[PDB]
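Support request, priority: normal
Reporter: lab tech (M.K.)
Component: structure prediction queue

Hi team, I submitted a job for Beta-1,3-glucan-binding protein from Plodia interpunctella yesterday, and the status page still shows it as pending. I've pasted the exact input below so you can check whether something in the sequence is tripping the parser. The sequence length should be 113 residues. Please let me know if I need to resubmit or if it's stuck on your end.
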Amino acid sequence: QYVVPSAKLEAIYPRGLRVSIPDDGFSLFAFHGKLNEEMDGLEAGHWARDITKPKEGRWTFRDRNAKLKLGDKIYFWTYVIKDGLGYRQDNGEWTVTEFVNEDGTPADTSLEP
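Reply from support: The job had stalled in the queue. We restarted it manually and it finished. Here are the results:
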């Protein structure tokens, strides 16, 4: 039995959120995440989207409608489906103190406007 991948998030500028998970030939990648609020189960949180088709050996959950702010913390749990064999990466966490570039890399060099 395999294990659930790792959801790598990033703060998009000026308003967005991109996530990624090392796919393993799955079929469904459900993402549940709340902003500034932990979780102890399966709460709707915020980012609640179920993907069925990866991107390229890795799923991508982009959200250009997430009004995030520096300092804020992330809390979520991801769920994959490898043909009736799902696994989730709960108790996950991420930061908002940094933002990445549309290029795909961190665009935070200690320069707060």
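The domain at 7-107 is CATH 2.60.40.2140 (Immunoglobulin-like). DSSP finds no helices and seven strands in the chain. Let us know if anything else looks off. Ticket resolved.
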